[PDB]
Amino acid sequence: QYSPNTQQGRTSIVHLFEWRWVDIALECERYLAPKGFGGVQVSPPNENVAIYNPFRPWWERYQPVSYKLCTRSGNEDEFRNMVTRCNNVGVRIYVDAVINHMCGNAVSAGTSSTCGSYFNPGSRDFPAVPYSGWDFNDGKCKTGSGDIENYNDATQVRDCRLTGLLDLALEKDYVRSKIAEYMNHLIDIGVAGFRLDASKHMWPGDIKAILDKLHNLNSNWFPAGSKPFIYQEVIDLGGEPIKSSDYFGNGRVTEFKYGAKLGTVIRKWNGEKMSYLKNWGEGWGFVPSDRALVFVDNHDNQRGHGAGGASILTFWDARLYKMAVGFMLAHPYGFTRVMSSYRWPRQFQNGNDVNDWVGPPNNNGVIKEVTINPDTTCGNDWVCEHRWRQIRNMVIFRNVVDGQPFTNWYDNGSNQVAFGRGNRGFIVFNNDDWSFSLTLQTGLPAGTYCDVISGDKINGNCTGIKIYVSDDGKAHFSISNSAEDPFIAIHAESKL
Ligand SMILES: O=c1c(O)c(-c2cc(O)c(O)c(O)c2)oc2cc(O)cc(O)c12
Ligand SMILES: *[C@@H]1O[C@H](CO)[C@@H](O)[C@H](O)[C@H]1NC(C)=O
Ligand SMILES: [Ca+2]
Ligand SMILES: [Cl-]
């Protein structure tokens, strides 16, 4: 469960948050395959509650009604078509599995669901997925409210309702089997793995029992015996009894400390500096690299009130964001997930965004298609960070330097740092309020290299900055604190 199952050489996955299946299928063919992306995390593909008070919020997708592959992203035919087309070009699909719970206990009964299935939260009746009151933790939870009230009690966090979400009795073989039936339908369709939503709210042993019921990947696309990639969404910032290490026997875990600390370092909060990143990784109290799923931001915390708070960097902070994503993609620690978002009317009121609930761009509730502009950016309010030159080229940088050691570290005692990846890549950062002009040891063979941040290598020439490495492996780097992107990256495949 620890291997991503991406093609050799492809080292990242991209979260195409709220994208429709037909648009992801096209994206796999026209961009993800040629640009070296390993795979895509898709939004929950199972039927969810259609919420209309706040109009179709993104979070309605985390309130299941059934396991039918029928959502605003598309139906089962559209989902299968996307998995087949993506797999046919070597780009994998990872499903966001919402398996800890069904919808909120106070949601009204009826057919207000993405596939019209009937459901009655009050009576614990979800007939589309034979689930009844016998399949929930109402009698197991010990809190006075029935909801999670205190994170200092690890039992309560697993057996009670997360903000009222009906909590499935995951100890029951029937419930484990209905979840495995859903996950195996997806594996047999061709998915390569899963993001296990709300993993902190599930017992490590219950997750293990479900994973033990899962098939190996579809043998028409994957080698025999390939186990699905599992990355568990566990929010562990160190202040509670639940530790993400309790989940290592099931697969990888999301390392939320990664984006939180990279955000405080790049924002320079409480005196933090990039020079402090030499020991980035386990040295900062993070999980083992081989169990980490890393990212700068995710769909939830990019809204400001999630794991990491206001320190999280997002596309809204474009300049610093590209630098954070660049550092992440250059550094060997963990398996990287790049975020791809949609723009919404962010409106801050008393320190909080009152529009953080806004769902994807839409016409009367129907998600808008992703349009591609001649300059390769996206229209219809899709941000497409994965298409930004500075991010896409760093996704390729990670591929080129795959397996290469962290070496040749340099720092000015403040925010000007640099490091290489063996003899395959080198990156330089300037987050100080002054210029960086210095000759550094790069560890790379002599020659002319194109900076893949300010430009590209096209037709044997560089469209942006050019770096000259001499026979001694040294090269001079000049980065003004007022440059569009205060960082330079060069690698074996950007060499002229
Ligand atoms: O609708 C909601 C929802 O889905 C989630 C949610 C959060 C997670 O961390 C999950 O893992 C998850 O599956 C769902 O947040 C919520 C928090 C609220 O206060 C109210 C809500 O209505 C939701
Ligand atoms: C490099 O760019 C110049 C134009 O600036 C062009 O004449 C030359 O042919 C390019 N080199 C290659 C190898 O295409
Ligand atoms: Ca639970
Ligand atoms: Cl996540």
The 3-state DSSP composition of the chain as helix, strand, coil percent (nearest 5) reads: 30, 25, 50
Q: Is 461 in the pocket of ligand 2 (CB under 6 A)?
A: yes
Helices (H) and strands (E) in the chain, counts: 8, 24
Q: Do the Cβ atoms of 195 and 14 come closer than 8 Å?
A: no
Tokens at 31, concatenated: 């961009």
Task: Tell me how far apart the alpha carbons of residues 97 and 45 are, in angstroms, rounded to a whole number.
Answer: 8
| 240 is known as an active-site residue | no
Rounded (10°) angle between helices 318-330 and 256-266: 130
> How many whole angstroms from its chain centre is CA 218?
23
Tell me how many degrees the CA angle 394-395-396 measures, rounded to the nearest 5. 85
Tokens at 289, concatenated: 């690299």
Task: Tell me how far apart the alpha carbons of residues 90 and 87 are, in angstroms, rounded to a whole number.
Answer: 5
From residue 180, alpha-carbon distances to 160, 167, 404, 449 in Å are 22, 17, 37, 49
- How was this structure determined? It was done by X-ray
> Which of 18, 58, 59 is the best mutation target for the ligand 1 pocket, counting ligand atoms within 8 Å of the beta carbon and taking the most?
59
Task: Tell me how far apart the alpha carbons of residues 59 and 103 are, in angstroms, rounded to a whole number.
Answer: 11
Distance between Cα 157 and ligand 3 center (Å): 7
- In CATH, the number for domain 404-496 is 2.60.40.1180
**Resolution of this entry, Å:** 1.2
Task: Tell me how far apart the alpha carbons of residues 297 and 274 are, in angstroms, rounded to a whole number.
Answer: 18
Residue tagged active-site, from 47, 197, 246, 356: 197
Q: What is the DSSP string of 407-446?
A: EEEEE-SSSEEEEEETTTEEEEEE-SSS-EEEEEE--PPS
> In the chain, where does the domain assigned CATH 2.60.40.1180 lie?
404-496
Residue tagged active-site, from 206, 233, 255, 432: 233
Q: Parallel, antiparallel, or unpaired: how do β-strands 474-479 and 436-441 relate?
A: antiparallel
> How many whole angstroms from its chain centre is CA 134?
34
Radius of gyration of the chain (CA): 23
Q: Parallel, antiparallel, or unpaired: how do β-strands 193-196 and 436-441 relate?
A: unpaired
Tokens at 315, concatenated: 């596309």
With a Cβ cut-off of 6 Å, ligand 1 is lined by 59, 62-63, 98, 104, 163, 197-198
**Comparing C-alpha atoms, which of 430, 423, 439, 425 is closest to residue 394?**
425
Q: Which CATH architecture has domain 2-403?
A: Alpha-Beta Barrel (3.20)
Q: What is the DSSP string of 327-361?
A: HHHHS-SSEEEEEE-B-----EETTEETTTT--SS
Task: Tell me how far apart the alpha carbons of residues 206 and 129 are, in angstroms, rounded to a whole number.
Answer: 19
Task: Tell me how far apart the alpha carbons of residues 352 and 361 are, in angstroms, rounded to a whole number.
Answer: 21
Residue 116 zone, left/alpha/beta (φ > 0; ψ -120 to 50; rest): left
Q: Do the Cβ atoms of 352 and 304 come closer than 8 Å?
A: yes
> How many whole angstroms from its chain centre is CA 385?
12
Task: Tell me how far apart the alpha carbons of residues 214 and 187 are, in angstroms, rounded to a whole number.
Answer: 8
Residue 271 zone, left/alpha/beta (φ > 0; ψ -120 to 50; rest): left
Q: Do the Cβ atoms of 154 and 160 come closer than 8 Å?
A: no
**Comparing C-alpha atoms, which of 444, 482, 481, 424 is closest to residue 274?**
481
Question: Nearest C-alpha to atom 13 of ligand 2 is from which residue?
Answer: 460
Question: According to DSSP H, which parts of 335-450 are helical?
Answer: 389-400
| Ligand index nearest the alpha carbon of residue 294 | 4
Judged by DSSP in three states, 147 sits in strand
> In the chain, where does the domain assigned CATH 3.20.20.80 lie?
2-403
Question: Nearest C-alpha to atom 1 of ligand 2 is from which residue?
Answer: 461
Name residues whose C-beta falls within 8 Å of residue 67's C-beta, 6 or more positions apart in sequence: 46, 47, 128, 129, 178, 181, 182, 185
Q: Do the Cβ atoms of 302 and 383 come closer than 8 Å?
A: no
Tokens at 345, concatenated: 């009317």
Q: Is 459 in the pocket of ligand 2 (CB under 6 A)?
A: yes
| 485 is known as an active-site residue | no
